[PDB]
Design a protein around this ligand. Structure first.
Ligand code: CLA
Ligand code: CLA
Ligand code: CLA
Ligand code: CLA
Ligand code: CLA
Ligand code: CLA
Ligand SMILES: CCCCCCCCCCCCCCCCCC(=O)OC[C@H](CO[C@@H]1O[C@H](CO)[C@H](O)[C@H](O)[C@H]1O)OC(=O)CCCCCCCCCCCCCCCCC
Ligand SMILES: CCCCCCCCCCCCCCCC(=O)OC[C@H](COP(=O)(O)OC[C@@H](O)CO)OC(=O)CCCCCCCCCCCCCCC
Ligand SMILES: CC(=O)O[C@H]1CC(C)(C)C(=C=C/C(C)=C/C=C/C(C)=C/C=C/C=C(C)/C=C/C=C(\C)C(=O)C[C@@]23O[C@]2(C)C[C@@H](O)CC3(C)C)[C@](C)(O)C1
Ligand SMILES: CC(=O)O[C@H]1CC(C)(C)C(=C=C/C(C)=C/C=C/C(C)=C/C=C/C=C(C)/C=C/C=C(\C)C(=O)C[C@@]23O[C@]2(C)C[C@@H](O)CC3(C)C)[C@](C)(O)C1
Ligand SMILES: CC(=O)O[C@H]1CC(C)(C)C(=C=C/C(C)=C/C=C/C(C)=C/C=C/C=C(C)/C=C/C=C(\C)C(=O)C[C@@]23O[C@]2(C)C[C@@H](O)CC3(C)C)[C@](C)(O)C1
Lengths: 219, 173, 180, 167
């Protein structure tokens, strides 16, 4: 089943490429959980990395472009620079403000994975037969409408012939901008600037995998 | 039967020239099976535990009260075994001494057809993992151990006899 | 599985010490009933499993263990280690002795006479099944771990008899002259 | 037996059924189920005050020489520099006294079935129903259980760090 379900959607992303599997990673246990939770976890991860990817690349361009002027912190408040590297605009974020960025993600990462309740309905399915799903229920606590992925609802008008043009595209759309990150974000760390890439964040950023540039260490 | 057994791969198939699988009963072959399974896992951890302990990976802090991790910026990885103190060497054996018990005290012992030695702590539910792809892994597990049983003997012979191994004698160990 | 695998599958009572109190009418209730003998054997076994491990974990050097709680008194042998601890730490020694005194008194206070078969409890059943074990296990395992506790109690009682004999008779157990 | 349909509070952060009895305590110690609830309600209330009571003390301090910021720099030390002078002996005397004359007769009346556990007679604002009173009870249980972990972190990190309100 699980091997057959990729080969149905292999031949839709690229019929010349087709079924891509030399490292044989989609048939086999992670922590010991079986084939049906194998593909759906890898069909999971390939788009979570890709959903951030489109949202990174659009997020990169506008920070190289026009910066955002107001008061950012309560005292001083200068808003780190316009032309300057969004790479190290991320490091020029204050120490406090990085935590609430990470904590609201963890509020959404706690949100994505639980499973349906034993006395009330709260959550969707996980990886047993689940898809790669959205969040779909934002009404469970005392809050107002900030439905995630749904600002101004209207997605109620497309059928199963038409939704496959939106799933499989974003697969390939998310793979482009994923390569669009590392094709650029290496080109600041190294010179080499894949075809030609020059008027840029001119030193290296400094440990792009670092959440926190300076304040606390571990030794 | 040597046919239908993980460990029989493509380049040799049934590798038994001196006919040792026939030498006893079926209970005999099951003993040699999980011997090689256990000989593998010790040698895989010792070969990999030789390569690091030689490049300077170096746990931060103190191993014991005064014999902290200077055992790596010093003596060879074949050494630093008497440098580990006795109470430190003792709990290693006894965690192993405990781990050899659940291995033996299952409901069915493996020479009576029971299961191979499983993980002592955090035993995920296990190889409910698609038995076609289970057979490919137990070939992977044993072959890496076959290579590691040779390799850990290479690492001992290089530490005793200099020049006993050509493209490996020019290595500081 | 039976508890008798080392004596031939049969109840090992040479010298008939369980049959006494019933052989004759001549001492009316002066020998213990089966229920009292069964709790004594479990209790002697449980105290011996703790005490052997205690003298084994505090022996320094040799095979030894030399493990030592920080702040307690350093004493080489186990023979004098109680009286040193009793003098130096009165509050800790008094709280352990009170805890042992209450729990051991509570063992018999709620149940009937043990010396006579009138107890209404299983022997060895102190209310310490906190882990919730035997409420999750099945009856074959629960009956099995009782025998495991018994024989390990029995191996430790013979150990404690060896540990007593080596210090009263210097050549008594020869496997420890060498072992130290 | 089966404490879960004998009481309330078998709910996680959501309100779905959780049934948190891993060690089977309420089955092995079945006559102590009322005492278990009584203690948990006691510990919870103590924690909910001692959370709030604590960390709201780095802002305000009642007037007086010892109270107002003089010999007591932080909120966390406030024990064993105040024990000697009297207010800890005074507050031990009453919490003691109260515990020695009314809540020990109260827990005597629980075991005879003459008292619901954790009652004390503070029926001023109860919704006076069955579905709504359980929801108030659950909201008390779920808050009190969080306050136990709360001051467990707040008292530990303030000896370690020594900082103000974010410890
Ligand atoms: C409604 C709840 C709420 C509240 C009360 C705050 C309050 C605060 N946020 Mg904020 N924040 C929130 C939700 C909230 N946030 C959410 C949902 C997000 C989206 C992830 C952010 C993203 C955010 C950023 C990116 C930053 C803050 C920062 C700050 C603080 C300014 C600190 C300062 O200058 O000290 C006086 C302030 C206390 C800043 C901060 O910590 O400055 C040091 C900062 O950099 N917040
Ligand atoms: C061209 C790009 C593209 C396309 C076709 C879609 C298309 C879709 N998205 Mg998607 N998405 C995109 C970009 C895109 N999104 C980006 C950049 C993000 C991150 C900010 C997301 C975050 C996102 C979430 C969180 C969810 C979707 C969902 C959906 C589906 C409704 C539909 C298949 C929802 C879904 O899977 O519905 C079935 C859903 O829950 N997407
Ligand atoms: C926390 C801030 C935040 C985040 C992460 C997103 C992120 C997202 N919004 Mg969204 N939105 C936001 C604030 C945000 N928006 C606000 C404040 C507005 C203005 C009111 C919009 C307007 C908008 C429209 C129409 C839609 C989103 C869509 C989306 C998805 C884009 C892909 C993505 C998950 C859209 C999407 O992908 O369409 C299906 C979608 O529904 N929201
Ligand atoms: C490509 C893979 C990769 C690599 C190589 C690293 C490497 C590292 N990660 Mg990281 N990480 C990764 C992927 C990766 N990450 C991913 C995918 C995630 C998930 C989002 C994380 C999440 C993560 C977290 C949450 C944290 C790290 C941290 C670290 C650092 C740990 C060692 C340390 O403390 O050194 C010292 C730290 C550095 C060299 C980097 C920051 C340097 C600052 C500016 C100070 C430099 C001064 C001084 C010389 C060094 C430290 C002193 C100290 C007093 C500050 C190290 C540089 C930790 C870290 O950096 O905290 C400081 C940390 O908290 N990682
Ligand atoms: C979780 C239980 C636990 C606890 C409380 C300890 C406690 C201790 N271990 Mg440890 N250890 C454990 C599990 C544990 N270990 C496990 C599971 C292993 C792997 C088998 C080890 C392997 C280990 C080594 C290798 C050493 C210790 C040592 C020590 C002691 C340090 C004392 C010292 O510096 O000399 C005062 C300390 C008492 C050290 C020791 O006692 O020698 C100095 C030492 O060398 N431990
Ligand atoms: C678990 C509860 C608890 C405990 C043990 C303490 C303990 C302490 N507090 Mg504290 N406090 C608490 C809760 C608590 N507080 C709460 C909830 C508040 C907010 C009002 C305060 C506000 C507070 C201040 C402003 C100060 C202290 C101070 C002190 C210290 C000296 C004693 C004193 O003057 O108390 C004073 C206590 C109060 C003014 C309020 C206590 C209110 C109690 C909890 C009411 C509940 C019981 C009540 C009798 C029930 C009546 C209900 C009715 C229907 C019958 C001492 C370490 C002083 C100090 O030295 O600081 C370090 C000080 O200046 N506390
Ligand atoms: C180095 C090793 C040492 C560290 C290891 C810790 C030691 C092991 C744990 C010891 C536990 C003692 C056995 C349990 C006794 C508790 C009795 C009880 O609570 O219910 C017994 C009573 C409950 O009373 C009952 O109430 C019922 C209503 O539900 C009915 O009315 C019953 O009739 C009535 O008996 O609770 C009381 O304590 C009330 C009297 C107060 C005085 C009791 C004596 C003091 C107890 C202190 C010891 C507590 C031990 C701590 C618990 C674990 C330790 C982390
Ligand atoms: C789940 C059940 C657990 C069972 C426990 C057994 C395994 C435990 C492993 C870890 C012990 C941790 C205790 C911490 C204690 C602690 O860390 O102290 C540290 C202590 C260090 O003592 P040293 O004398 O080195 O210290 C002196 C200095 O510290 C003073 O300067 O090490 C021990 O004593 C080693 C314990 C080995 C004990 C062997 C156990 C029993 C098996 C015996 C079987 C062999 C003979 C029979 C063969 C047939
Ligand atoms: C079988 C079993 O039970 O085990 C379990 C254990 C456990 C833990 C449960 C499991 C797990 C989880 C695992 C293993 C997760 C691993 C995750 C991992 C490994 C995540 C890396 C991210 C790296 C990034 C994003 C790098 C960015 C790098 C960037 C952005 C760079 O620029 C690199 C950089 O170099 C440049 C290009 C230029 C230089 O100038 C500077 C620097 C250095 C910045 C598994 C899988 O289940 C297995
Ligand atoms: C003569 C001279 O001069 O040249 C030298 C050349 C050279 C090359 C140096 C020599 C050599 C020998 C070599 C290269 C020897 C290498 C030997 C080898 C191959 C050693 C592998 C060990 C495997 C390990 C540690 C894996 C553990 C894996 C563990 C602990 C797991 O977690 C299992 C795992 O499955 C789970 C349960 C979950 C799964 O999700 C996946 C993972 C992995 C997580 C010689 C012969 O000496 C001579
Ligand atoms: C080697 C090492 O280092 O380990 C350490 C840790 C270790 C092992 C923990 C150590 C210890 C301390 C120990 C052993 C302490 C022991 C304490 C002990 C033994 C405490 C009993 C309380 C009994 C109660 C409250 C009974 C209530 C009984 C109740 C509530 C009942 O009504 C029972 C009832 O049954 C009826 C009548 C009928 C049933 O139908 C219904 C139920 C079940 C409800 C050491 C010595 O320090 C060593």
């Amino acid at each position: 089943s699980a091997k057959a379900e990729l080969e149905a959607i292999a031949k839709k992303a690229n019929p010349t490429l087709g079924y891509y599997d030399p490292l044989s990673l989609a048939d086999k246990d992670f922590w010991g959980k079986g084939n049906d939770a194998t593909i759906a976890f890898l069909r999971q991860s390939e788009i979570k990395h890709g959903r951030i990817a489109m949202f990174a690349f659009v997020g990169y361009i506008v920070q190289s472009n026009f910066v955002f002027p107001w008061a950012q912190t309560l005292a001083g408040a200068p808003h780190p620079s316009a032309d300057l590297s969004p790479e190290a605009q991320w490091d020029a974020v204050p120490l406090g403000a990085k935590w609430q960025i990470f904590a609201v993600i963890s509020a959404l990462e706690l949100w994505d994975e639980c499973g349906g309740g034993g006395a009330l309905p709260h959550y969707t399915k996980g990886r047993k037969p689940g898809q790669y799903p959205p969040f779909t229920l934002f009404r469970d606590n005392v809050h107002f409408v900030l439905d995630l992925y749904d600002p101004f609802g209207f997605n109620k008008n497309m059928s199963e012939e038409t939704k496959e043009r939106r799933l499989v595209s974003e697969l390939n759309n998310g793979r482009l901008a994923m390569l669009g990150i590392f094709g650029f974000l290496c080109a600041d760390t190294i010179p080499g600037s894949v075809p030609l890439l020059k008027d840029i964040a001119i030193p290296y950023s400094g440990q792009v995998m670092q959440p926190f540039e300076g304040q606390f260490s571990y030794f | 039967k040597v046919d239908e057994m993980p460990g029989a791969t493509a380049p040799l198939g049934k590798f038994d020239p001196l006919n040792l699988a026939t030498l006893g009963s079926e209970s005999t072959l099951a003993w040699f099976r999980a011997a090689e399974l256990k000989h593998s896992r010790v040698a895989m951890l010792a070969t990999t535990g030789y390569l690091v302990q030689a490049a300077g990976i170096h746990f931060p802090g103190m191993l014991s009260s005064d014999v902290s991790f200077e055992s790596l910026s010093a003596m060879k990885p074949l050494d630093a075994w008497d440098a580990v103190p006795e109470g430190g060497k003792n709990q290693i054996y006894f965690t192993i001494f405990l781990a050899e018990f659940i291995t033996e005290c299952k409901g069915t012992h493996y020479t009576k057809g029971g299961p191979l030695p499983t993980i002592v702590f955090p035993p995920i539910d296990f190889s409910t993992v698609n038995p076609e792809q289970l057979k490919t892994r137990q070939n992977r597990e044993l072959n890496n151990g076959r290579l590691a049983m040779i390799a850990i003997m290479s690492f001992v012979a290089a530490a005793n006899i200099p020049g006993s191994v050509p493209a490996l004698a020019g290595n500081p160990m | 599985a039976t508890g008798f695998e080392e004596v031939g599958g049969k109840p090992w009572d040479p010298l008939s010490l369980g049959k006494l109190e019933d052989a004759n009418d001549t001492f009316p209730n002066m020998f213990p009933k089966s229920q009292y003998l069964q709790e004594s054997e479990i209790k002697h076994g449980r105290m011996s499993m703790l005490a052997w491990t205690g003298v084994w974990a505090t022996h320094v050097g040799g095979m030894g263990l030399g493990m030592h709680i920080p702040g307690m008194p350093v004493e080489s042998d186990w023979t004098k280690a109680l009286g040193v601890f009793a003098a130096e730490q009165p509050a800790l020694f008094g709280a352990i002795l009170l805890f042992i005194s209450i729990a051991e008194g509570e063992s018999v206070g709620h149940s009937g006479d043990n010396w006579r078969n009138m107890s209404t409890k299983e022997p060895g059943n102190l209310g310490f099944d906190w882990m919730g074990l035997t409420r999750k296990l099945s009856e074959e395992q629960v009956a099995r771990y009782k025998i495991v506790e018994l024989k390990n109690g029995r191996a430790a009682m013979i150990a404690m008899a060896s540990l007593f004999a080596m210090e009263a008779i210097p050549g008594s157990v020869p496997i420890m002259n060498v072992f130290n | 037996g089966s404490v879960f349909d004998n009481y309330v509070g078998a709910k996680d952060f959501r309100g779905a059924q959780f049934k948190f009895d891993p060690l089977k305590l309420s089955e092995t110690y079945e006559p102590f189920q009322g005492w278990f609830r009584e203690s948990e309600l006691r510990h919870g209330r103590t924690a909910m005050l001692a959370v709030v009571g604590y960390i709201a003390t780095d802002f305000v301090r009642i007037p007086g020489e010892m109270y107002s910021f003089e010999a007591i720099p932080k909120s966390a030390d406030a024990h064993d520099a105040l024990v000697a002078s009297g207010p800890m002996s005074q507050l031990l005397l009453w919490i003691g006294l109260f515990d020695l004359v009314v809540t020990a007769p109260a827990v005597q009346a629980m075991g005879q079935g003459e008292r619901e556990p954790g009652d004390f007679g503070w029926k001023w604002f109860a919704p006076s129903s069955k579905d709504a009173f359980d929801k108030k009870r659950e909201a008390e249980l779920l808050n009190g259980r969080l306050a136990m972990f709360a001051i467990g972190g707040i008292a530990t990190q303030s000896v370690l760090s020594g900082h103000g309100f974010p410890y």
